[PDB]
Structure 1
């Protein structure tokens, strides 16, 4: 239900007057509400694994969600959360995902959080994964820009 709430609430690029189809006085609270929603979507997941595992269907959705305005706060945080306790969602990658992440790094600047995220992406626990690893090495552009 919360994901459906977010989805129907996702469809608002600025949410200034585009959220004012119910007029003002709710678009104001919209940003706080969606930030809190992603905060709870992080809060319900930390330490869990059963809740962690389900996002194999939802992975391309969340990495494509990334509304760029209330997402560097908390969407990246929940992404960091889910990509630790679950190797089952680790191994289902399509190579558009890391490219969008790299573009996010470029467009949002030098954040150590993204780097810790890729550090977790390489390894769940003990076992490494080579395909996405080599994809990360080549997509780290040795043009070095």
Structure 2
């Protein structure tokens, strides 16, 4: 429920997701707790739809973590659209990722 509260506080402002540079890899490091990850997942999904700046922060070592997150949990479509939101920003898409 704590992650559920924090998932609320991102969906409103473009500021708050832009205020989440350093928490990103901090959250992805906490993602490997692997018992409360869905609460972390809705958090990391909601920041990715509201900041194009945060897309340029996240790099490959976070991505291979998220790919192995599909290994530990199997078939979770909530993980899947996170990669689709990692593809396209509000209008644009990065060729590197």
TM bracket, shorter-chain basis: over 0.9
Higher helix share: 2
- Structure 2 residue corresponding to 1:59, chosen from 18, 24, 35: 24
Mean CA deviation greater in 45-54 or 101-110: 45-54
Tell me the number of residue pairs that the alignment of Structure 1 and Structure 2 aligns: 96
Unmatched segments (≥5 aa) in structure 1: 1-35, 133-145
Local SS of the residue matching 1:130:
coil
Structure 2 residue 10 is matched with structure 1 residue 69: no
Give the aligned CA root-mean-square deviation in angstroms: 1.0
The whole-number CA distance in structure 2 between the counterparts of 1:70 and 1:112 is: 16
| Higher relative contact order structure (alpha carbons within 8 Å, sequence separation ≥ 6) | 2
Structure 2 residue 33 is matched with structure 1 residue 49: no
Aligned position for 2:64 = 99
The TM-score with structure 1 as length reference comes to 0.63
Displacement of 1:119: 0.5
Q: Which has the larger radius of gyration?
A: 1
